[PDB]
Ligand binder design. Structure first.
Ligand code: OBH
Ligand code: OBH
Lengths: 239, 11, 246, 12
């Protein structure tokens, strides 16, 4: 059967993506200014667990996603969840140079990343990605397109997904043309944005490797959902 | 193995 | 500066001339396969390829304009992505197989010889299949391999260090202009050009993923002690092992 | 002290 996603116009695609946006969640007000391995992991895991529920319901609202089998939907979310949390983080950190806005009540600097072993390197990569998005003046409409591309492109190999990915490309080009960019500027900006996706993948892989290690799993008790999302990646890891 | 994600993705 | 003065056709000619040679493995079909021998053939092959990759990188426009420390950083970050893109390129015309060398053509079943390797072989085969169905051209392949080198370490790098990143971004913009030029020359409509540009750059995220997943197995104690590894390859692996969990 | 990669890149 045919997918509605392809029949959508560029404006209907942008509006369906902007309407699907999950909200910005707050951290627990309980522990303030984390400075230990346990407090830092406690806050971030609690926040990630709550954002995951919103992400699942967001993915169901991404045109083309509902048309996939339940098994393929599980696979894409299992592959992309940390990349999705990370692009979300980098977006909302844009207006905060040198800081990561994990939540409006949880603004962290690189010195806090030092509290957890292996974290500051990822924090530095996240800050540089936020900084790159800031200098490029990334727009909200472009952000929701990039986030949808991360979800559909997460699985390394298919016809339906590649037709939806082409529609999103057309949507990104439609936004840049609507912004007054020339053809050279449109293809240059399309490339710049998509190359940043390689970096978001790299951050996810590096972060995931630390998150599914035994030492990272033992810092604080993890929810059953977070543990299942981690084990989807741990399964491929070396023994 | 019955994943939570399988339940959560159902309407 | 020389990279910025190049026309798209000149960029293509320079990248094509810079191409490293295809090396042979020490594969002997009279000898049976094992975890150690398979790891031995691939490591020895990768090791000899690294030397040609170093000399290829020096010929990538804009690369020698960087500081020595930045050239080292980009090659440390991208080496496995670059070996992988080369492998999937030369494997294109061999469905269901990976042409590691003209004398080393391997199935996914042979990948089961090494623990954790078949999952990577499946991803490499999928990527090769994707390049084949898109009818990836040699001219496009050389642009992508150069983008990998320049892009993969650009964010993991004072105001002097910032000018280096700006120069990398300018050269990357030139390679994009080159890719679009190739597609326009091929008669694609503007919508087809942008869609193909996007499909190729999304494949780069898959190549990053494969390199990260592969690297994690390569710097594990099992793979480090399976066969005696060479010094340059050990240092290239350690550039990654250094950030990994203890 | 400079690594093998730095040495091979430095070479002319
Ligand atoms: O890749 S990370 O830095 O994870 C670690 C954790 C320990 C050591 C090294 C990396 C990750 C990105 C950001 O900080 C961490 C982390 C996190 C996510 C899930 C968890 O189960 C635990 C923590 C982050 C994060 C959390 C929520 C977001 O909205 C965005 C990012
Ligand atoms: O990502 S890998 O599959 O590496 C492993 C190794 C063991 C277990 C899981 C993955 C890698 C890609 C391909 O097969 C491996 C491997 C390799 C590279 C460097 C080494 O020091 C040893 C082996 C591969 C390879 C070798 C040469 C190429 O031109 C292209 C790919």
């Amino acid at each position: 059967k045919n997918s509605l996603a392809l029949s959508l116009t560029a404006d209907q695609m942008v509006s369906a993506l902007l309407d699907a946006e999950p909200p910005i969640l707050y951290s627990e007000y309980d522990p303030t200014r984390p400075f230990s391995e346990a407090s830092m992991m406690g806050l971030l895991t609690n926040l990630a667990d709550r954002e995951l529920v919103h992400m699942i319901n967001w993915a169901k609202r991404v045109p083309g996603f509902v048309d996939l089998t339940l098994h393929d939907q599980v696979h894409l979310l299992e592959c992309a969840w940390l990349e999705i949390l990370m692009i979300g983080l980098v977006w909302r950190s844009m207006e905060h140079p040198g800081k990561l806005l994990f939540a409006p009540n949880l603004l962290l600097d690189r010195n806090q990343g030092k509290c957890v072993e292996g974290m500051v390197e990822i924090f530095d990569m996240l800050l540089a990605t936020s900084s790159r998005f800031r200098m490029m003046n990334l727009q909200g409409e472009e952000f929701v397109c990039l986030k949808s591309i991360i979800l559909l492109n997460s699985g390394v190999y298919k016809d339906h997904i590649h037709r939806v990915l082409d529609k999103i490309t057309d949507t990104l080009i439609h936004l840049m043309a609507k912004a007054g960019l020339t053809l050279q500027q449109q293809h240059q900006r399309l490339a710049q944005l998509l190359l940043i996706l390689s970096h978001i993948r790299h951050m996810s892989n590096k972060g995931m490797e630390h998150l599914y290690s035994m030492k990272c799993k033992n810092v604080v008790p993890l929810s059953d959902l977070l543990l299942e999302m981690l084990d989807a990646h741990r399964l491929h890891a070396p023994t | 193995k019955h994943k939570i994600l399988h339940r959560l993705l159902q309407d």
